[PDB]
């Protein structure tokens, strides 16, 4: 028996391996920590083919998609264990009423600044250009951060109204995306103007921003707790504070709960459970990871209470409360690819802000569906159809499906409909002109449950 | 403005028209009560084309479907009014969290018997053949009831294991249908044998059975409270009692809550509300209807208490307690059509019991969908596909749909996935042989969430 763990390369993987060593000492079970690039993207393929890790660490947003596809083992910790972690952290790793991972720590981005360059950091994003111009006369810049991952730019986009999926009545609506509204637009435009006026560069990534900050070349960066360890070993005298406002509004970072899921195909699930409950999620376990790269606000009450007085963590939590806990619904992956695309294109000039976000809006609503009711004589049959795709793309196979569904329907209630008959088929509302085939159901203004017929 | 009301022709429509005349007297608003044949089948088509009644009366089972398709207005009685009816009746008219009709009364089938022909009615279905021989010697028969509508045969079909859709933790599973299991077969076979052995006739419908019982030609019938009025005016001395057992188990009638829905296109929604709240659902209103044809155990607490003492209503409730409240899910009507034809065909000998029920099982089960996740490169996309239809029927348009949904996806993530076919498209699990195109997802053992790829 053995445990293979996947964790991101920016986290305390060496510290986690120390917890692994201790576990091995006590049980004979070897633990191997790995940090492959794009592990959150690779996990589905490998997990499905029996090649995945036994345990995967990532922020909770990815785990809904994994769970929906059966990739993660349901977690059944006793109430004694559940009590040891904050309740809102368990909420982050619940999918369809089941717990699907162990929560580890709460992460939010903060503003990190160099006290020697910048004794008083700006309250507002709008101050940055003037500050940069002043700093440029001394061979420095105001602000550098990773522009290749939308995680980092989201706080600014959401500040004046950008949102991912509309939440209400317990539910996220994947048809209602907030990536093209006025707020998101104003946020991204502000970022792109920073680039145009040479206050930032479109190609700046994680390592470039981190090096600039840790070498005293830029006055500010935006990052999470994991980054503090490299800043400590550097010269820099730094603080961690609330993100700047934009148009008077707090920056609203998406908050992640670093979580550990168990592969549903692991041959060693019981050992994974014992490793995480009795070794990792202890004061001693989290200390070993946190000492390598800080976790932020850990989900473990006893240790959280112990670190809470650290001002860097207090600032993490201040930024967290101003932000939003990420959804964990499956469509988050598609949201993130869309926003990533939109930020990168707009920043580089390949697309205008309007065009980038309009496309992202389109795409984040991946395969939204509309339920329609087909009326065939007196028989009604519900169909789930793509909302945004033109009707002509799927009408033929849809008529063939209905044919098979209704084949044993008694003919009295069928109204004489014969789907085997030849035809140029189209949808129509009863007593109305047919819907044009080159439109989607959305284009046609069709709501869930709408009654439709077919006509030839 | 006027109110046009539809109610079934077995109900107290003259009594209801009397409540109508009182409303007209007080308000000047004319009320027209109509009882068209098959009104529950007609309602969707006419309602969608602006020709429906303002108010429709039917058992609650139909109203989920009407509501899903926007044909019913949302009902907003204040709490004072809601407290006047039993909570369980409101539950019956709740669809997706909204009240969609006013509940009027609880209806269950009972056994009705001629006390002069049969002082002690049988406790078991199994007794009926021998009882019928005795009664034939006297020119009479034992039992006659409507065989043309599955409502009346369902209690027997359900006794030893028949069910419509399996229910558990809050939700009905339309993939899990109980129409062709051993219990349902057992029940329906018993019925078909009564007909083979000449204890009943397959052609017997509602009027024939009613006429025979009310003339004193048959010792028993099976019917609901609406029927008692015609027996009262007849010379028959009758009792209403618990249905007989089958294989030692209670007959389980499907219980309906007769309910009044308001048409979403009614130009007179407020008038219908005042009529239903302040005129029908009062002791005086319900009494007027009940005096024409009995309603059963009414939803209005004040009047239900007044009539509870009546042993005919107590027997109704006893039968209701042994049975089950009907689902109001939209799939109910399709279920009913399938079972209707299945019983008629077995009873006539046109098909065997096994083949009739197999077809109704397949017909009620063919509406279901399965959620799958398609992996293209490292990108996952959820699709909602028909569960019981062969994959080949919809694969081509499905691939075309997916191509359109993915066309603005960034390419690094699609990992060189080739969208142009090397011949026939097929689904496959990651790293596994393809699924057979002539099978459904159900045949292939695919559950909700399954990770599939596309291969050619
Ligand atoms: O950039 C989109 C990306 O954002 C988040 O990923 C974070 C992660 O939560 C942190 O733990 C940290 O490692 O940085 C990542 C961003 O580079 C989402 O969790 C992730 O799903 C999403 O793709
Ligand atoms: O036979 C199937 C039929 O059953 C029920 O209809 C009942 C109705 O509930 C009663 O009020 C009474 O009038 O008799 C009907 C049977 O003829 C369901 O309510 C109906 O939806 C279904 O088609």
Numbering used by the authors:
A (entry chain A), B (entry chain B): 6 to 461
From the publication, what sentences describe this entry?
The ESX-1 type VII secretion system is an important determinant of virulence in pathogenic mycobacteria, including Mycobacterium tuberculosis. This complicated molecular machine secretes folded proteins through the mycobacterial cell envelope to subvert the host immune response. All ESX gene clusters contain at least three or four ESX conserved components (Ecc), named EccB, EccC, and EccD, with EccE being present in all ESX systems with the exception of ESX-4. In this study we report the molecular structures of the periplasmic domain of EccB1 and the cytoplasmic domain of EccD1 from the ESX-1 cluster.
The MBP fusion protein used as a crystallization aid provides additional crystallization contacts, but it does not perturb the fold of cyto-EccD1mt. In both structures EccD1mt residues 20–109 adopt an identical ubiquitin-like fold characterized by a β grasp motif and an anti-parallel β sheet with strands in the order 2,1,5,3,4. Interestingly, the asymmetric unit of both crystal forms contains two EccD1 molecules and in both crystal forms the two EccD1 molecules are arranged as a head-to-tail homodimer stabilized by an extensive interface. The interface is formed by interlocking side chains from β strands 1 and 2 and the N-terminal α-helix of both EccD1 molecules and ~650 Å2 of each EccD1 molecule (13 % of the total surface) is buried in the interface as calculated with the PISA webserver. The interaction is stabilized by 4 hydrogen bonds and a cluster of buried hydrophobic residues including Met1, Val54, and Val58 resulting in a solvation energy of −13.9 kcal/mol and a Complex Significance Score of 1.0 calculated by the PISA server. The extensive nature of the interface and its re-occurrence in both crystal forms, with or without the MBP fusion, suggests that EccD1 is a natural homodimer. The dimerization of the cytoplasmic domain of EccD1 raises interesting possibilities regarding the nature of the transmembrane pore.
